[PDB]
């Protein structure tokens, strides 16, 4: 029917944000990896399989995508942060999980 607020520290919400980040980084024109600063919000609906919409606050790191960094990739002072709306759609009877990056914009 409609969306319901979900907790941004749910272990499943976190996993999903992580996956949405890999997707943002894989598809983004940026040469440098982005990292999640925080999950701003999370909300799920269940009309046809589960649809989860996340807002992620993300920052650039100094980890180049053209590389293989030695560890964690840490957010950097500037650091123009973005907010990306991401929709993740799950249909476990089709064994289906589709992550859609809906929009990113300057925050």
Residue numbers in the entry: 6 to 112
Please give sentences taken from the publication describing this entry.
Cysteine protease inhibitors (CPI; cystatins) from nematodes have been found to play major roles in modulating host immunity. Cystatins are a group of cysteine protease inhibitors that bind reversibly to cysteine proteases and regulate their proteolytic activities. The predominant target proteases for cystatin are C1 (papain-like cysteine peptidase) and C13 family (legumain). Structurally, a typical cystatin fold contains a five-stranded anti-parallel β-sheet wrapped around an α-helix.
The human gastrointestinal nematode Ascaris lumbricoides infects as many as 1.5 billion people globally and causes malnutrition, retarded growth, reduced physical fitness and reduced work capacity in infected individuals. Although CPIs from many nematode species have been studied extensively for their roles in the induction of immunosuppression, the structural features of this group of immunomodulatory proteins remain largely unknown. In this study, we found that the recombinant Al-CPI strongly inhibited the proteolytic activity of cathepsins. We then analyzed the structure of A. lumbricoides CPI (Al-CPI). We identified the critical segments of Al-CPI molecule that could be involved in the interaction between Al-CPI and its target proteases. Mutagenesis study further confirmed that these segments were responsible for the inhibition of cysteine protease activities.
